[PDB]
């Protein structure tokens, strides 16, 4: 049930984003742990430094490296994932 | 009404965060704009690169530069502000 709202990344990395987040929602209930899982997977796979926010109510303003930004919904939870540093 | 929950940052810079966020909450109604305002002010004053999340429900896992992290509440909104890159 993935709705990508904003993305500056390749399609493959987008798809990896969605699937990594889906796995994290299957495994964890707390937003922070879901975010931790995603962030850690991405630092491992794609190199640091990634940052992830998971929640139903937030606004953000962030800065990211070219081609390394995604903001999408999975059901009712919004997920922001991006690389910086 | 600032409740600092988690901080790795000088006291002065902490107090600047809170004041900056208070001014932002007076001025803007939308979380994203509040975050935008705070992030932008911090890039100007303390050099890039800062990132800011403002909301009533989210979890996060992020990485920051030593002494450049704060997470606090201001009324019913939580604010995450940190520097990386």
């Amino acid at each position: 049930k993935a709705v990508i709202k904003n993305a500056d990344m390749s399609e493959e990395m987008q798809q990896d984003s969605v699937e990594c987040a889906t796995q994290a929602l299957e495994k964890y209930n707390i937003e922070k742990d879901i975010a931790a899982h995603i962030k850690k997977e991405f630092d491992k796979k794609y190199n640091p430094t990634w940052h992830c926010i998971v929640g139903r109510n937030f606004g953000s303003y962030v800065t990211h490296e070219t081609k390394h930004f995604i903001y999408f919904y999975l059901g009712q939870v919004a997920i922001l994932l991006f690389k910086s540093g | 009404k600032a409740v600092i929950k988690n901080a790795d940052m000088s006291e002065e810079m902490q107090q600047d965060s809170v004041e900056c966020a208070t001014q932002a909450l007076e001025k803007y109604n939308i979380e994203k704009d509040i975050a935008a305002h705070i992030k932008k002010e911090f890039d100007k004053k303390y050099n890039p690169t800062w990132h800011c999340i403002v909301g009533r429900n989210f979890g996060s896992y992020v990485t920051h530069e030593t002494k450049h992290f704060i997470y606090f509440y201001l009324g019913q909104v939580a604010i995450l502000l940190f520097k990386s890159g």
Binding site: K5, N6, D8, G55, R56, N57, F58, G59, S60, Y61, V62, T63, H64, E65, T66, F69, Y71, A78, L80, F82, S84 | I30, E31, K32, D33, A35, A36, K39, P48, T49, G55, G85
Partner: peptide, 11 residues
């Protein structure tokens, strides 16, 4: 590396 700022808002 190019750096770009972005804002997001849940509805």
């Amino acid at each position: 590396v190019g750096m770009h700022s972005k804002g997001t808002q849940t509805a």
